[PDB]
Amino acid sequence: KYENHTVTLKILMTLRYVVSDILKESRYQYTKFNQPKSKFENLPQKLLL
Amino acid sequence: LEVDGITETIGTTQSAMYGGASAQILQINEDIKELLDGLRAYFGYNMIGL
After folding, report:
1. Which residues sit opposite A29 in a β-bridge?
2. Distance CA A18, CA A49 (A)
3. Is the dihedral of CA B37, B42, B45, B46 positive or negative?
4. Which residues of A are less than 8 Å from B3 in CB distance?
5. Which has the closest alpha carbon to B23: B34, B33, B12?
6. Where would I find the beta strands (DSSP E) of B1-50?
7. Chain-chain contact of B3 with A44 (C-beta, under 8 angstroms)
8. Would you tell me which of A18, A23, B7, B24 could form a disulfide with B2, CB atoms 3.0–4.6 Å apart?
9. What is the chain B residue with the closest CA to A24?
10. Percent helix, strand and coil across chain B, each rounded to 5?
């Protein structure tokens, strides 16, 4: 029925992102309290999406 | 402690006037006193003639 008609839509789509830069990229702690020995833990990165 | 945009603050129960577990100890005393006073009534006072 709509061979030569126009069609328009209002649509919902899932949010999506890509990492375009990594910022304040690494933060660190030698956690030692209440451990058998010194341990290295990487704290949260910040991403610019 | 604040490093590189991440910060943390902690305030312990420790203080110059009272230790960190002082609340637990002081509640233990409150129970022991009630518990001990009541139990002494099971045995009673001591008497000796003279």
Report:
1. A41
2. 5
3. negative
4. 27
5. B12
6. 2-3, 6-7
7. no
8. B7
9. B4
10. 45, 10, 50
Residue type, A1: K
Taking CB atoms and an 8 Å cutoff, what residues of chain A touch B12?
none
Q: How far apart are CA B50 and CA B46, in angstroms?
A: 13
* Contact by Cβ (8 Å): A18, A40: no
> Determined by which method?
cryo-EM
Q: Given in angstroms, what resolution was this structure solved at?
A: 4.2
CB B5 within 8 A of CB A24: yes
- Residue numbers in A near B6 (CB within 8 A): 27, 43-44
